[PDB]
Every structure is written in structure tokens, then in C-alpha cells.
Amino acid sequence: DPAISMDLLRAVLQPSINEEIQTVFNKYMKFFQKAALNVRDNVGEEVDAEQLIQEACRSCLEQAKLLFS
Amino acid sequence: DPAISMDLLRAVLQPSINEEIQTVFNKYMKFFQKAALNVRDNVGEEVDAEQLIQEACRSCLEQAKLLFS
Amino acid sequence: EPRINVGSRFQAEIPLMRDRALAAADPHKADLVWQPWEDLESSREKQRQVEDLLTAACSSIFPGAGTNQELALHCLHESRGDILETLNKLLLKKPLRPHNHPLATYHYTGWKMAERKLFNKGIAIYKKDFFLVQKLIQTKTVAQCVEFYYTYKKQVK
Amino acid sequence: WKMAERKLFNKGIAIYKKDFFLVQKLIQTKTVAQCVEFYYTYKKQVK
Amino acid sequence: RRKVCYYYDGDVGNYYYGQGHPMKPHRIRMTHNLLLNYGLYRKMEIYRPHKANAEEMTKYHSDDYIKFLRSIRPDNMSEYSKQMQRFNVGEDCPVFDGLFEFCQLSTGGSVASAVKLNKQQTDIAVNWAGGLHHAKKSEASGFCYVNDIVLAILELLKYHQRVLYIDIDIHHGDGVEEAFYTTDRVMTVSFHKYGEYFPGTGDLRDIGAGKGKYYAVNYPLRDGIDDESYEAIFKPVMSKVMEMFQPSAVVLQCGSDSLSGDRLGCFNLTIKGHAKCVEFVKSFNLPMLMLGGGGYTIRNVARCWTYETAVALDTEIPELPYNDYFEYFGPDFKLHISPSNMTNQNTNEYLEKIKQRLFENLRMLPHA
Ligand SMILES: O=P(O)(O)O[C@H]1[C@H](OP(=O)(O)O)[C@@H](OP(=O)(O)O)[C@H](OP(=O)(O)O)[C@@H](OP(=O)(O)O)[C@H]1OP(=O)(O)O
Ligand SMILES: [K+]
Ligand SMILES: [K+]
Ligand SMILES: [Zn+2]
């Protein structure tokens, strides 16, 4: 398929874009971090605070797709 | 539920974040726009250039989730 | 068994045996058209990016002659190490304008259905003229005429 | 149709170009029908 | 590791000798495309060569030979027929459009490389367009019209007291040999088939003359030499040559027609054995210039000159990657070839005889 051009331009730009996105979330990580810790403080040890942070920031990127829907 | 508290915070912050992401992609929209038109220029009328641009920018967000794996 | 005629022997290499860095040219004899670059391009972070850059091109990106990889090969060279300066002068106004001083570019890069039909018959009559078929199509040259003959010969299989 | 006969066919047709009796003798195994059939299928693969 | 400078112009692959002619310059373009898709082009100093003018072509050839070449065309072909016989242009050295421009490129690529090594701004230089070794001072021969190899060598002598020339090509390098036959400064070694074969030259007794006597080694051969045989006779010799001649710069002609399955050649070598030579010379660490030359099963010429480039770069390469001419390369699409069931008529006695004769010749030189 010729439209694969889009997929591969994408792979070219993904490293650069990922750098800028990481810069964005770095501003907001402190909110996620304590929120996860507050959970692991009010629930027991079986809470993985790091997993909660990662899941939340993935969910953020999912919801951002509405910018391009 | 833990994930509910987090997604609940996620909803609060989604408008502010969606603004900043839109700002980011505005820098990159031209590259998508040229490429999508170029596909239509070569393939023909049945290509939806706008649909290609949207699909690509959604895909960038899917791949950004690897920042938070 | 041949003879060694003194007149047709050779022309006296005429050395100094040192001539050490004697202001020679060959910036004239040859023109530089690539430098090794692994500092920021292949530092085990970006060496795979160009691999993706190039397979990227042989797809629905703009044509110049029509093999869309070669244009991207050409253009990373064109940029000396850069990404956006590549991507811009790649896509920006035309690929011919930013680089004209080498002229290898136009050499390397260098057909309608109408001429195609006449070519097929023009070759199915002579089959080895390449001078009258050149007069059949004064617009095109023997090079392109010969080039299309190969591309067809490959499309046979 | 084998690649061997295919090569000889291509040359056998690139010499006569309209015999269909000597090329038949070139390949006694095959008939003018199949020989003519392959000539069309190639003529279509040109485009 | 060694620095490599590569030279190439794209019109070279488009010049055409004529119908049925075994020389096809398009092979060099294929190589250029494979070096690329291998990812090697990336690694070395690439250059276009500018056109070499009659100014510097005449530094070896006759002023009117070059004037004839500059003037001749197929248009004035019947007008010039008197001179054409004088200059060997004919049956196997045809006239074709763009002939002179083809020469300017093949020569310009070599002479540019000659200066780059003289300038001491590279360690290796390559020009696969070059390596045409049958051309004479005042006439064409064996598909060669201008002997760039000489013209290259003539530059290096300015800088280099002793230049070594070597020839793998299955055809004997009589042109370069003749063009340095009576100079001690240039040693011409040549391994080649002999007996009922072009140029009929380079027998055991072709030794040299005058000052150049004992500076024109030769090594005739019969059909079907193996890589193992060739290696067992190449390395010992060249070791002694380096031991005796002691050059300060090498010129290797990488004749590919000595490979197995060549159209015109009738040797039984592989890419590996042909390249193992190029490794061995590279091991000696001199300023280097690898050229091409003969080779007529172009699918293997591509495989050959490509791989040999990697050896100058001492990198590994697998599986032929995709390229424009990927479909040329058989059903296998592999780099390496295997030798044939062809018979090796080079008996150990015949090889050991000539070996010892040469050792005697090489012992005649000064040493301590
Ligand atoms: O039909 P193919 O298997 O592809 O081989 C042909 C064929 O060579 P053989 O006759 O040795 O098979 C042509 O020879 P003729 O048909 O002209 O007698 C030859 O043309 P030249 O002999 O004039 O070179 C041509 O080579 P090219 O494609 O360079 O014109 C070459 O095709 P391949 O080069 O693809 O093998
Ligand atoms: K030789
Ligand atoms: K000599
Ligand atoms: Zn040869």
C-alpha cells in the first residue's frame, strides 16, 4: 500500500515527539506521584504506586486522541 | 476503586493538557498536511486527506504511551 | 610475443621521489559528496532512525523521477547531518533548486504511452538500430530509450 | 509451459514474429493453440 | 581502521558499447546501488570525479591519439576510417556515442584518487570505473582506450619512490607492463591465463628490459584455478615482492573476469578467494588504490566489487538486501559464488616449477 508513507514518516518523528511529550508530563508528574502515594497510604502495600502513575499517563495520551478525532 | 480516583483526577486535568498537546501538534500539522495531500495528489480523489491527517496524529498519541509503559 | 617499440614505450614518469604535499588540486578532479557521520547520527540512538527515514520514502511521498527512496537518500546527503533542514529542503520548493553545484544530482536522476507504443513497434522492426529510433523520438535520447528497454526487459520475468 | 521453452519461444518469436509453423516445429511437444495462447497472455502482461 | 575514498559518476552506467559487446559499463552502477543498500556508502568518503581533459590524458598518450579520440564520432565514422585502422578502433573496440566522455570519467576517477593518496588525505581509494589495462600509448586495445592506470601511476611517482602495480585480471596487464617496461621504479606483477588467449602476453620469460629488467614479473596459468591454489601461490609471492621491491604505494587492479562462471574468463575463483587477495594486500598497510577492470558476468562483478569494498572498510555484510537491480541476482540473491566442477589443469609440479624460477629472479635484487 502506498499509504504506508504515513506510518514511516511517523516512526521518523516519534523520537523527537516523544522528547517533547516527556517534557510536558514532567511538569505534571508531581501531581500523579503524590496521588499514587496517597492511594498506597490509604490502601495497603499491595498498591503499586509506580504502576498507577504509568497507567494514568497512558490514559492521558488516549484521551488526547480526541484532539485528532 | 484506585483507578477511579486517578481517572477522576485525569478528567480534571484533561482540558489543560489537551490545550498543550494541541499547541504541540500545531507545530507538526503542516508535515502531515503536505504528506496527506501528496497521497491524494498521486492516488486520486478517493483519498480523504483530512482523514489521513487525523489517523496519523491519533497514532502518534498511541505510540506516546510507551513513555508510560 | 609482442614487440616493445622505443617510440611507443611510455612517457617517462618524471618524478621527484618526494613532491611532498606539492599544492596539488583534486578539489578540482573530484567533489566531496559524503562524510562519515556517526557522532549524533549513529550513537546507538539514531543509527536506526535513518533506517526508518529511508524505508519511509519509498511510498506516497513526492516523486522526482519515480523511485521515492532515492530522493530521500539524496537529501540526507544534501543536509550534511541534519533532520529538519533535510525534511524542509526535501519538501521545500523543489529538489533541484537547493543543490545545483554538484550536477551529479541531475546526472543520477537522469515516457508517455504514445511514445511507448511507437517505441515497442520501433524496436519490433529494427530491434538493434538505436539511431533511427532516436530519430523516431527526437525529444528523447538514446540513454532514456535504452533505459526503458532494460526496465521492460526486467518486467518480462 | 517451462522456462526453458519460454526462452526459446521468446527468441523463436523474436526471429520470425509471424511463422506459427516453424515455431511449432521448434516445440513439437506443444501446439499452435497453447503457443498462441501464451502469446496473448504475454501481450496482456505488457501493460 | 583505514579511511576510504570512493569515486563515482552516474553517466558511466549509461554509456553503451554496442550490440552483443561483453563490456557493459552498467555493472558499475549496480555496484554503486549495492554499496548503498548494504549501508556502506554511508561509511566512506564519496566523490564525483570531474572530467579529465586532453591536457592530462596526453601526459602519457600521443597528442594526436587523444586528438583523434576527441574528434571521432559515429557521425564521422566513415570519414576517419583511415585513422581507425591505425588506432585499433573496430571489431572488439567499437565506436559508440559518448565514448570520449566515458574515458574522461574513468580517467578522472583514477587521477583524482591518485592525488588524494599523494595528498596523504586518505589510506585507500577506489574507482571501479577505472582499471582498464590493455590500452597503449598510441592505440586502443582489449576494450581499453585510455590507460588511466598509467596516468594514475605517473602522478604517484611524483611522491613515491617505488610504486607497486598488481593485476588479478585473467587477462595479462600488458598495457601497464609495456608502459613501465624499462623502469625499476614501477614493478608490474601479473597473474593470468596463458596459451590461446588474449593478449598472448606475460609468459614466464617476460621479465623486463634495461633498467626495468627484473621489475616485470609474470605468472602464466591454465584453466580452472581454485581459490586454494591461487591463495597458495599469491601470498608467498607478494610477501617476497614486498620483501624485495619495498614499494611505498600500491595499485591493485581487481580484475573480476578471473571469477568462476565468467562469460569470457575461464578461471574457477569465488568472491572469497578473489577478495582474500585484497585482504592480504590491505594487511601490508600502504597507500592504496583499488581499481576494477574486466568482468563480464555482471551479476557477479556487482557481487565482487561490492564485497571487496567492504574489505577495504573491514566491515561485515551478510543475504543481498533490496535494491534497484535486486532482480538481476538469479533465484538465489546471494553474494557468494561457489566454484564449478571445471577441472584445474594447474598441476602442483607446474606451479612449483615456475615458483622456484621466480624466487631465483627475486633473489637477484638488493637486500641484507
Ligand atoms: O535473456 P537473459 O537470460 O536475460 O540474457 C540476456 C541475453 O544474454 P544471453 O543471450 O547470454 O542469455 C542477451 O543476449 P542477446 O539476447 O542480445 O544475444 C544480453 O544482451 P547482450 O548479449 O547484447 O549483452 C542481455 O544483456 P543486457 O540485459 O545487458 O542487454 C541478457 O540480459 P541480462 O543482462 O539480464 O542477463
Ligand atoms: K593479470
Ligand atoms: K618494470
Ligand atoms: Zn580482463
Side-chain angles (χ1 to χ4, degrees), chain C residues 62-126:
Chain C
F62 60 87
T67 48
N68 302 345
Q69 55 102 42
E70 183 55 36
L71 299 170
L73 281 82
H74 182 243
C75 197
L76 194 146
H77 158 55
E78 191 192 338
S79 193
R80 323 307 322 126
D82 194 300
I83 310 92
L84 300 175
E85 198 257 339
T86 316
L87 289 149
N88 291 125
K89 268 171 167 165
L90 187 66
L91 177 150
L92 190 137
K93 60 217 173 298
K94 330 173 191 169
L96 278 75
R97 298 283 78 212
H99 273 223
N100 55 0
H101 69 271
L103 183 59
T105 79
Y106 309 139
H107 292 338
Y108 298 146
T109 59
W111 280 97
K112 315 171 216 67
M113 282 287 179
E115 297 192 342
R116 201 179 275 111
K117 288 181 183 291
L118 306 187
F119 161 86
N120 294 325
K121 289 181 183 294
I123 298 307
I125 290 155
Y126 307 127

Side-chain angles (χ1 to χ4, degrees), chain C residues 1 9-11 13 15 21-22 24-26 28-31 33-36 51 73 102 108 128, chain E residues 8 10 36 42 44-50 58-60 112 115 119 157-159 178-179 182-183 185 200:
Chain C
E1 65 275 19
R9 262 173 171 209
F10 60 94
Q11 196 167 334
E13 55 269 20
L22 195 148
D26 188 37
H28 171 72
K29 284 83 191 166
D31 186 75
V33 296
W34 174 246
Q35 288 290 108
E51 311 314 334
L73 281 82
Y108 298 146
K128 192 46 66 151
Chain E
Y8 179 86
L36 186 65
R42 190 193 311 242
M44 63 200 97
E45 317 281 18
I46 314 293
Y47 287 84
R48 178 174 57 85
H50 284 237
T58 49
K59 280 179 157 171
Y60 163 64
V115 180
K119 277 274 177 156
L157 285 150
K158 304 168 88 174
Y159 288 60
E178 185 174 297
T182 64
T183 174
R185 283 197 47 151

